[PDB]
Design a protein around this ligand. Structure first.
Ligand SMILES: *CC(=O)N(c1ccc(-n2cccc2)cc1)[C@@H](C(=O)N[C@@H](C)c1ccccc1)c1cccnc1
Ligand SMILES: *CC(=O)N(c1ccc(-n2cccc2)cc1)[C@@H](C(=O)N[C@@H](C)c1ccccc1)c1cccnc1
Lengths: 302, 302
């Protein structure tokens, strides 16, 4: 029993984290095979943040302009390029600790562990979710950039996120490892606003399903409801629409709890309309939406 | 900006987690140097859980009775003993991945990362705190036992917790790595109850201090208060007494925020007496007490 925001073990990613440098600018990179990956904003100066021309800037730099440091050691940059918003710095040496990996672009609502890195040294791990507005509510400080998000597929590390910037909202924007931003965010110092953050509906139900399995069942109502009925109420409180996929994805938890999906929805509808009256579910005084059904299955099954 | 329940990177502990076996009973062990450590309850059968005599039982077993498995490999047990509630199984081979380590008995209110392990395979990481009743509100399933709690001291891993059992409360009891239980719990199948769980007061203030630093400052009142005044109100809602040590330990956050300790206390007093009115602090609808001042400094400083 018990339910916690749980991260993947970070061991196979610790061994891939390097320090990358330009002048007064050190950030984190990710050394996989004979390539090191970091945010291309490591080439910028404080003068050229308002509107930088990254192509032009990279022209000014050469292989030897970039100080890649592995713990106490240094790597020879035998070639650089730019893939969208990432520097791919080629190196003489292949990481001997390179785990099997993939690069996946994750979908909003999906979750991943973050290994928060300063000066190429892993500092800490936490679980995070792509919000529907394509921000993340991270915990990053100055120097955090190039810190990565990942899932672990049996023995295969999937990298889904690279940290690039904090918004004035105090939330976080980043790319996949092919260097495309999640959302409309750009890597320049201009006015950018995160759109309306909406609740992830399948995740909240996942979590109610976790709650039941943990014996917290008070919120369960004698009622049920319909998709359309439920999604009319949903929209009113900034919630994602529930779909038949969403329903199907909750089958294993439906199946384990004995509780139909649509009866859980009816419980949520009453919880949305009445709030929680100071009552808590799984130690929270509000509805949690940063666990998927998989996260719930993994933690509540094995 | 941002504040999350953050774990230490688990890399140096992954390499110490082994599978330990007896008949129908497999749990986790911890291989440091030429010693493997696990809960001594791996020697028990379902018949001898109500009141087991561990000495007597161990008499029945020998070195070769215990199947220690490292991933795909097997270790030769060249000697066993019992230290309080842990098996120290001596092995031919020293762990080549043994990080510098210490064994510390942690104090109630202090926090540590847990590496949740099934069948000697690390499954996930989360941050946890010793509650004042000396339970932990973990996330463990069947097979979790021998999973360890640790802090990372620069490069030195400190092991503070080994998981032994779940209470009917659905909360968790375990030992230090010398095999003494945190609290009055015993490793037998008898009626055991976790006493009154009290809130960790320094931690809540730590967290309010994190909140301020993140710009969440609404709860700040025009008032202040006294220790005695504050601790009279504290006791009423099952809260730890605040001491001058507690005050001193919050100096760095006092110092960073510009806010006196005793003015933060006055804010807490009004928050305790009035609740939060549906207002949230750092994304929580209730007062969080599983971060220490150190955790707050580490995450909000670097
Ligand atoms: C790496 C880093 O920690 N941050 C950061 C600094 C500089 C830049 N940059 C873009 C173009 C040239 C240089 C990106 C990121 C800071 C940070 O992002 N601050 C925000 C307000 C910001 C500044 C400048 C441009 C864009 C954004 C940081 C702070 C906290 C968490 N992550 C990053
Ligand atoms: C290792 C394990 O996961 N659990 C466990 C099983 C058996 C024993 N045991 C004590 C004396 C002989 C055998 C200890 C722990 C279960 C578990 O602890 N279940 C509880 C209810 C319990 C059963 C029997 C004795 C004592 C406690 C488990 C389940 C969930 C989380 N941790 C452990």
């Amino acid at each position: 029993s018990g339910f916690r925001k749980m991260a993947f073990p970070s061991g196979k990613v610790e061994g891939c984290m390097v320090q990358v440098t330009c002048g007064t600018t050190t950030l984190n990179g990710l050394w996989l095979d004979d390539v090191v990956y970091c945010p291309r904003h490591v080439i910028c100066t404080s003068e050229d943040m308002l509107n930088p021309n990254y192509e032009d800037l990279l022209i000014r730099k050469s292989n030897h302009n970039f100080l890649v440091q592995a713990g106490n050691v240094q790597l020879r940059v035998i070639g650089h390029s730019m893939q969208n918003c990432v520097l791919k710095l080629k190196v003489d040496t292949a990481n001997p600790k390179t785990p099997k990996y993939k690069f996946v672009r994750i979908q909003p609502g999906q979750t991943f562990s973050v290994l928060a890195c300063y000066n190429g040294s892993p500092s800490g791990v936490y679980q995070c979710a792509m919000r529907p507005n394509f921000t993340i509510k991270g915990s990053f400080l100055n120097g955090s950039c190039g810190s990565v998000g990942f899932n672990i597929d049996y023995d295969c590390v999937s990298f889904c996120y690279m940290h690039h910037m904090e918004l004035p909202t105090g939330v976080h924007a980043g790319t996949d490892l092919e260097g495309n931003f999640y959302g409309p965010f750009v890597d320049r110092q201009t006015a950018q606003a995160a759109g309306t953050d909406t609740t992830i509906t399948v995740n909240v139900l996942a979590w109610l399903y976790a709650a039941v399995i943990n014996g917290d069942r008070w919120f369960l109502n004698r009622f049920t409801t319909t998709l359309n009925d439920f999604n009319l109420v949903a929209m009113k409180y900034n919630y994602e629409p529930l779909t038949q996929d969403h329903v199907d994805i909750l089958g294993p938890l439906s199946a384990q709890t004995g509780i139909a999906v649509l009866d859980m929805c009816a419980s949520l509808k009453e919880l949305l309309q009445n709030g929680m009256n100071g009552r808590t579910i799984l130690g929270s005084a509000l509805l949690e939406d940063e666990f998927t059904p998989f996260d719930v299955v993994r933690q509540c099954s094995g």
